[PDB]
Amino acid sequence: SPEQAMRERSELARKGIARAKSVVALAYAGGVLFVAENPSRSLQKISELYDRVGFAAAGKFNEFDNLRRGGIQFADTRGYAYDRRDVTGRQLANVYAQTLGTIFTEQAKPYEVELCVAEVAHYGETKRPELYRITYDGSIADEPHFVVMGGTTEPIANALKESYAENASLTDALRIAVAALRALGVASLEVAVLDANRPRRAFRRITGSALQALL
Template sequence: MSNMGFYVSPEQLMLDRANYAKKGIARGKSVTVVSYKDGILLCAQNPSSTLHKISEIYDRIAFAGVGKYSEFDQLRIAGVRHADLKGYSYSRDDVDARGLANIYAQHLSQVFIHDHKPMEVELVVVEVKADQTNDEIFHVLYEGSVNDEQNFAALGGEAEQVRDHLANNFKPNLDLKSAIALSTEALEAQIASSDFENSNSEQANPVETTNSSSPKIQVGDLEAAVLERNKEGRVFQRLTDEELANYLT
């Protein structure tokens, strides 16, 4: 990074980079992960039905990313390649979420320190296990730190409200319908708070605030997929708009 010969303290450099990455990530909508009785549910607010935030990596492993699409999609592709190569050279049982989360972390920290700019992404790598208490949720941040989350996770710019909502309402052994309800409510909490911020900053437009009922996510704006706990082989399954509409009524 060019500093034109002036001294920049390492603290300042790291802070600038972190702020740059955070800003990029904050532009995107959040993703939720919720472990439930029969699997793990991943939900994202995503109006596009073709540019996915949630994807399959391997038999029991899924991936979700927020931030800059081109960057997390590049990491998704690398993850699928890593998993398929590992499964081919060893065995399908040897591919695990922890290993993948670690090499993502390595790569992100390498880029954060050495490249021209940090990656504006936040990822989650999840693996469904036979027993709900053993489900693995790894949350990887833009600078390469890894958090091992229990039961649920939220990522994205407004993740704090979403995470708070999940933390206050999560129960073990939810069924899929309740898990979807919990996830969409958490995502809606985020919209509500960001709308609140907007209405505060844009006081020239007070008409918007008269609509006080909490905003609902439309089925078409929701992307959802599950890793099914009790199936064999490739257990990743996207939920169609029809299925989602049924669960949300």
């Protein structure tokens, strides 16, 4: 009976993600903001993939770390084979959806992860940021405003469905997301942005007293 097996694998994966912590991504005036609860400075939940593409994940660390390494390898090979400007976040989201669907179907235990891919416009260009959410079974959805993954997402999703303001500042957006995650100081928080104003590499981490000032 395929339907029973599919239901059980889905239930296992959704229990796995339900016991994890929450990471939220928000589109603001200068790009995309990543905020996650991470009491460890050594195991990171947010990373960069290419010049204007960002990575975020929730769930089991080793599974999405393997996924992040594979995505970096794919992006580097594609950029070297064709050229740098020919690498977009849509291709990465598609390749992630294919590999997660294959893992869900063929492997003994599915991956208990939820992924998000973010892209920003190139330097000196005006384009709305894109957020893609990839689910454990391979479903891919395109989100215009924000993505919430991990833990209990309904209260955070409501606290962000209200009070979200387009073209907000970095400080206001950071405060808003920090408020929404409670439905946390410099420690236990991992924060990164994709800065559209940067010439080539848009990814940078906000750590230490610089993060303290903006809170």
